[PDB]
């Protein structure tokens, strides 16, 4: 490895390189200025960001003596031997030229003494402390540390003299990811069709250890494609096929579509197949949502030139089975940002504060792997009018609602997290979460009109073969009050009658493809039992609430300056 | 056991096969393409799918050294010994030729660091992290893992360089089960009559060791039935019939659902009288998707899933549920009304989601939600705890029955007595498509019910039930059962009287017209006329909406 | 808060110990009604952990300690759930009501939010302020964001046309005329009257008070 291997974080690279090299190459400046350089480094960040790579690069770069100490490598069964090992390590490091000591995974060696209950760990921590800064402290020896959790470290170690400077090796940005792709695809035989800029744009939450995985599995896909039929020879490979090895763009697209960020590996949503062409009607809602989710991600330069932060939240309310969850699925399928899907009460727990912990964890993962789309289905479970729970379940629901409030709008870094909420009873949601800044636009998803119903039918029967003489306009006109679920039910009933006829005809033929498509009589018989899902009283409540929103909205229409 | 022994999962088998074999066989291709291969796998899935079997197969087939590590075997009590054990294992593996390491049940060793109280578990987690990733981490050493709870692992462990790809070794399909049967039944002597294809089609949720259990139980049944019949030549006449396999299949159930098994109750389609139209519609709705998926995929539509029976009490909805559970191939999951609820916070919803997860895992499955009046109710009650949990449960039901899931042939069967109190979002199509009303039987329906109830019992040759059927005009199947019970009780009382008289000094092997007449003079007509008015009003309102 | 027994109060003690150690310190307690609710309300509780937490807060903010200049700031929109003991003077003595903006305050807010945005030379905000009556700062922000969104849309379509063969150097009057037709008031009259009633009950606590001479 070398200095060019670590790419994506030049600032941290320079910050470490300063005290690692300059006081060793030319200390004349420090002797002129009169102050000694820092002699303590703590690299922290999410796993796979490049901490161990930075340590390896420093070891390869410096001509100084290097000493690596793994975390649990020091502990022994004998009482008083771990500290002896630490003492031997530090004395050996100090006896030689100005050396560097790298301590990997320091969360194991050095926990907080107050919270631990054993004795050997406390004694090891005290030995480390006195070795780092005590009488006769150190002699031109620099100590580097790497950790995934800095908060679980003894406060006495997070001090000047022991670990003065803490570098934050964080998630790369678009340019950093482009650098990582260039670094990791510089030694392989690539194809001519590769534009690394598109890949660096479409990859969002990859920590840099996932870029290597993506590249390697893409290469494996390419070799698999060129191996399956061209050369399946267990004995030996002819050289001709080796020279025709270029990892193509289709392979990279496949690799991107399969892989996901390592951070969100737990919360990967199982793939469902919904499409913008699969969602009929709701064209205005479709375009509005597409803009709200695409503009801040595709065009950050525009927002930065205009000096304003994008609108993020959005809530859907309306009668059930109108397309709210379907729109959520379509978004999760064909938006380019990561998706986090949670059901309503899915994050509740019997333990005290554990629901709050889960909410905090999911929103921290969402901002960490941003841009991210978090879908909150059925808000009425987790977010109700605070204080109205006179029957006390311990009041934990109020705490949940408060946590949601101050996690969507509080002391945060203003990262790109968009929240879509979906409910069919908006009146039971707290007013403090329907405010702009959390859920800005409140979109009513109304019952389909005639054209909407016709479009819904065309979308649902996009792939089913149909009779050439069939027309769905009469079906759309006949309903006048149905929903998308009801139209789906009609379609499924027509399918049911068609499959019944097909099966019985095939059975008769075998006893001694007659139906290649659904027919007019099939639709006529499936429409005999058609029913409306939503009554008028529920429709009356929804229209009344929407009219209340219009009263909150209708004061302006269009005004004159 | 070689690769031939492992079967039912081809994609995952190829995934592990290529990584473990091709780099050790022809590294020239990796040298040419200039990328190193992945060197880490975490096999996960439900218990008993064949993860350890595949590990054993690759170990026994590859020429590379294999080192086995068990989960708790490395842990100790002294400070700094478990990490020493791991270091010894890894260094021993790396000292020799390129090798494979297998950490069975890794979830025991390495839980999430932040959510543990001990210290040795944190040290050993950190030791695993440092061993797999670190300065000069590995060289021609491949690591494989096996676990049942992937989410309960340190996220720092689930990264490239430690466990590059997580292969999902899940349950097999119908064809996979076919190959599993063929593999397991390769050494035992079978009879010609039995065909494994029908058995594979009949089994739905059985995975691996479940099929092994089926085969072993069938063989044991054959041995037990022959061993008791008889007191060298016996060995020749050792053959397992189709009846043995049928017995084993009827007595068995998939492991994931074994705790949820229902006590066997014998009911058949002929045991339910009347309701022919509803019975046929239900049969169509149930066996159409499972027996003929080719037609459904040809037409490119999904099938209707949910059904709801409502009507007066006792008319036979739970009887239809029993009949389905007996006479459909799909697995059954019965649940009482409030059976899922709990006093704790956020547990009744966990209960609902676990049962639905198991159902959709062992698909196809029929979940019978009995007495929805309790679970569903109507969202938006009288504020406070009157609705606090009754709304969360309903929302969990809604989002589990429809939303953000993969369609996997799960049919919910409902049963209620006052459907007007059900939340309207539950009744929506796509959740509970069919709203079937099960009315009080008419004259011919009552005749059919009587004939069904009297199927297996002695009857007088000159006895007719038309008078009994016509002389009620307001009864229900429960009331007819009550009449039959009273008639049987009087007949058996007469039989006991005759037997006692004969002892003091079969007299009546059949029930008599006078027995029925004496029993019928005290009838019930349980369903009141107000309940009938309510049900008729609801049904005509539904028809008006229709 | 934590699932274990006593770890909530341990965390509170650690936070306040840090605050008084690195004094002078400012501690912001966001949504005080989440952790500091009136005691005894919970019929069924987790062993009375919330009561223990609020008692810990009470004793630490006023007990057998010193006054090392530590300033507690609370921000809650439901002052009815806060326990009376916390609101005592000497613990949280200043109750500041942040009402809805007036005409000049809406104008000030709009100018504050447009301080880094290019604007049309002839555009005046007095009309927008005069037209938003019941709005809040969040609502004015939403209006501004919608105007920015329409400006970006026009810029994007203009650039698309340019590539097919600054077009929008700054926001115009039209982006507000078209962006304020969907604006709405976040707080209804029910909550407004609830907060007014709360303010007036505190005023009624100040009974028989006027410009009086000693």
């Amino acid at each position: 490895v070398g200095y060019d291997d670590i790419g994506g974080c030049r600032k941290q690279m320079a910050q470490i390189r300063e005290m690692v090299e300059l006081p060793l190459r030319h200390p004349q400046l420090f002797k002129a200025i009169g102050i000694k350089p820092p002699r303590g480094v703590l690299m922290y960040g999410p796993p796979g960001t490049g901490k161990t790579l930075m340590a390896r690069a420093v070891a390869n770069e410096t001509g100084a003596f290097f000493f690596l100490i793994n975390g649990p490598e020091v502990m022994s069964k004998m009482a008083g031997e771990s500290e002896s090992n630490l003492r031997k390590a530090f004395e050996e490091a100090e006896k030689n030229a100005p050396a560097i000591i790298f301590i990997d995974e320091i969360d194991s060696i050095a926990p907080k003494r107050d919270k631990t209950n054993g004795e050997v760990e406390r004694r090891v921590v005290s030995q480390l402390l006195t070795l780092m800064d005590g009488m006769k402290a150190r002699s031109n020896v620099v100590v580097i540390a790497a950790t995934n959790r800095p908060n679980s470290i003894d406060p006495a170690l997070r001090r000047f003299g022991r670990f003065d400077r803490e570098v934050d090796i964080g998630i790369p940005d678009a340019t950093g990811r482009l650098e990582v792709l260039r670094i990791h695809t510089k030694n392989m035989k690539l194809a001519d069709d590769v534009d690394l800029e598109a890949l660096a744009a479409e990859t969002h939450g990859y920590v840099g250890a996932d870029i290597a995985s993506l590249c390697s599995e893409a290469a494996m896909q390419q070799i698999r494609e060129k191996m399956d039929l061209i050369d399946l020879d267990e004995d030996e490979i002819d050289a001709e096929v080796l020279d025709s090895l270029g990892v193509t763009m289709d392979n990279f697209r496949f690799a991107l579509g399969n892989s996901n960020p390592s951070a969100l590996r737990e919360t990967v949503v199982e793939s469902v197949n919904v499409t913008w062409d699969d969602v009929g009607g709701l064209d205005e809602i479709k375009e509005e949502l597409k803009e709200t989710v695409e503009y801040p991600v595709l065009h950050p330069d525009q927002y930065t030139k205009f000096g304003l932060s994008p609108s993020k939240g959005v809530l859907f309310y309306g009668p059930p089975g109108t397309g709210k969850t379907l729109l959520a699925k379509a978004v999760a399928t064909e938006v380019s940002a990561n998706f986090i899907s949670v059901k309503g009460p899915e994050l509740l727990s019997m333990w005290y504060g554990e629901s709050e912990s889960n909410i905090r964890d999911i929103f921290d993962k969402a901002r960490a792997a941003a841009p991210t789309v978090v879908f909150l289905d059925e808000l009425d479970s987790i977010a109700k009018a605070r204080g109205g729970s006179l029957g006390d379940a311990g009041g934990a629901s109020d705490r949940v609602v408060n946590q949601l409030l101050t996690e969507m709008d509080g002391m945060n870094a203003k990262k790109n997290v968009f929240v879509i909420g979906a409910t069919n009873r908006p009146d039971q949601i707290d007013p403090a979460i329907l405010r702009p800044g959390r859920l800005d636009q409140l979109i009513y998803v109304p019952l389909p009109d005639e054209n909407a119903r016709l479009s819904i039918l065309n979308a649902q029967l996009r792939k089913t073969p149909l009779e050439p003489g069939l027309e769905l306009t009469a079906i759309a006109k006949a309903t006048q009050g149905f929903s998308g679920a009801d139209l789906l039910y009609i379609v499924q009933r027509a399918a049911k009658y068609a499959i019944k006829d097909s099966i019985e005809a095939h059975r008769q033929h075998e006893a001694e493809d007659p139906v290649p498509y659904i027919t007019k009589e099939h639709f006529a018989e499936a429409m005999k039992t058609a029913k409306r899902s939503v009554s008028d009283a529920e429709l009356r409540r929804y229209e009344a609430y929407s009219q209340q929103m219009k009263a909150s909205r209708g004061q302006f229409s269009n005004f004159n300056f | 056991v070689g690769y031939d022994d492992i079967g039912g999962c081809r994609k995952q088998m190829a995934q592990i096969r290529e990584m473990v074999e091709l780099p050790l066989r022809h590294p020239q291709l990796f040298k040419a393409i200039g990328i190193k291969p992945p060197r880490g796998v975490l096999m996960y899935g439900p218990p008993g799918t064949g993860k350890t079997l595949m590990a054993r197969a690759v170990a026994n087939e590859t020429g590379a050294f294999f080192f086995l590590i068990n989960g708790p075997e490395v842990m100790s009590k002294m400070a700094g010994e478990s990490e020493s054990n791991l270091r010894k294992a890894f260094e021993e593996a790396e000292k020799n030729a390129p090798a494979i390491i297998f950490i069975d049940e890794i979830d025991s060793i390495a839980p999430k660091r932040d959510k543990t109280n001990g210290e040795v578990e944190r040290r050993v987690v950190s030791q695993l992290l440092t061993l797999m990733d670190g300065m000069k981490a590995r060289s021609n050493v491949v690591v494989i893992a096996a676990t049942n709870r992937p989410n309960s692992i340190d996220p720092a462990l689930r990264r490239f360089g430690r466990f590059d790809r997580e292969v999902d070794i899940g349950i097999p399909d119908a064809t996979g089960r076919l190959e599993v049967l063929r593999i397991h039944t390769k050494n035992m002597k079978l009879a010609d009559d039995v065909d494994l294809e029908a058995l594979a089609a009949e089994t739905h949720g059985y995975v691996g060791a479940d099929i092994a259990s089926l085969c072993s139980e069938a063989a044991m049944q054959q041995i037990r039935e022959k061993m008791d019949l008889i007191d060298a030549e016996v060995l020749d006449s050792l053959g397992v019939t189709m009846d043995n396999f049928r017995f084993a299949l009827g007595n068995s159930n998939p492991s994931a659902l074994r705790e949820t098994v229902v006590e066997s109750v014998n009911v058949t389609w002929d045991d339910v009288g009347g309701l022919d139209e509803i019975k046929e519609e239900l049969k169509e709705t149930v066996e159409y998707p499972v027996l003929h998926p080719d037609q459904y995929t040809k037409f490119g539509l999904s099938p209707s899933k949910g059904v709801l029976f409502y009507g007066p009490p006792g008319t036979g909805k739970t009887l239809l549920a029993k009949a389905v559970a007996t006479e459909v191939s799909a697995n059954f999951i019965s649940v009482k009304g409030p059976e899922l609820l709990s006093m704790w916070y956020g547990e009744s919803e966990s209960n609902i989601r676990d049962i639905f997860d198991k159902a959709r895992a062992a698909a196809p499955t029929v979940v019978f939600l009995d007495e929805l009046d309790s679970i569903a109710k109507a969202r938006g009650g009288s504020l406070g705890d009157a609705g606090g949990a009754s709304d969360r449960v309903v929302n969990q039901l809604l989002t589990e029955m429809d939303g953000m899931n993969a369609k996997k042939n799960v049919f919910v069967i409902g049963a209620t007595n006052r459907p007007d109190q059900i939340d309207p979002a539950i009744l929506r199509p796509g959740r509970l498509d069919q709203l079937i009303y099960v009315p009080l039987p008419d004259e011919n329906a009552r005749l059919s019910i009587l004939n069904a109830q009297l199927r297996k019992t002695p009857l007088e040759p000159g006895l007719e039930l038309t008078a009994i059927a016509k002389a009620t005009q307001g009864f229900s199947g429960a009331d007819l059962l009550y009449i039959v019970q009273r008639a049987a009780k009087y007949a058996i009382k007469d039989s006991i009287e005759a037997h006692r008289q004969h002892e003091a000094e079969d007299p009546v092997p059949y029930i008599t017209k006078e027995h029925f007449a004496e029993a019928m003079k005290t009838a019930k007509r349980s369903v009141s006329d107000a309940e009938l008015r309510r049900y008729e009003a609801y049904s005509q309102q539904m028809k008006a909406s229709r | 808060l934590s699932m274990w027994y006593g770890e909530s109060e341990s965390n509170i003690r650690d936070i306040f110990d840090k605050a008084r150690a690195a004094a002078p310190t400012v501690v912001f307690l966001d949504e005080l009604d989440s952790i500091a609710k009136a005691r005894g309300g919970s019929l069924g509780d987790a062993g009375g952990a919330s009561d223990r937490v609020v008692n810990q807060l009470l004793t630490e903010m006023d007990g057998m300690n010193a006054k090392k200049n530590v300033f507690v700031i609370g921000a809650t929109n439901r002052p009815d759930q806060i326990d009376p003991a916390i609101l005592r003077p000497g613990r949280l003595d200043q109750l500041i009501y942040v009402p809805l903006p007036d005409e000049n305050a809406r104008l000030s807010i709009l100018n504050a939010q447009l301080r880094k945005t290019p604007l049309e030379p002839g555009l005046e905000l007095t009309a927008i302020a005069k037209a938003t009556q019941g709005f809040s700062g969040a609502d004015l922000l939403y209006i501004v964001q919608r105007a920015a969104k329409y400006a970006i849309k026009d810029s994007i379509e203009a650039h698309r046309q340019h590539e097919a063969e600054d077009p929008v150097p700054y926001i115009t009057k039209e982006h507000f005329a078209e962006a304020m037709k969907t604006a709405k008031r976040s707080v209804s009259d029910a909550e407004l009257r609830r907060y007014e009633a709360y303010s007036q009950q505190m005023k009624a606590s100040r009974g028989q008070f006027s410009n009086f001479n000693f």
Binding site: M78, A393, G394 | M78, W344 | -
Partner: peptide
Amino acid sequence: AAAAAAAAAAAAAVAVAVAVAA
């Protein structure tokens, strides 16, 4: 000569749960 050895295994903790009334 003899020798000593150190060992620190674990302890026992206490959790707190929340219940729902009706």
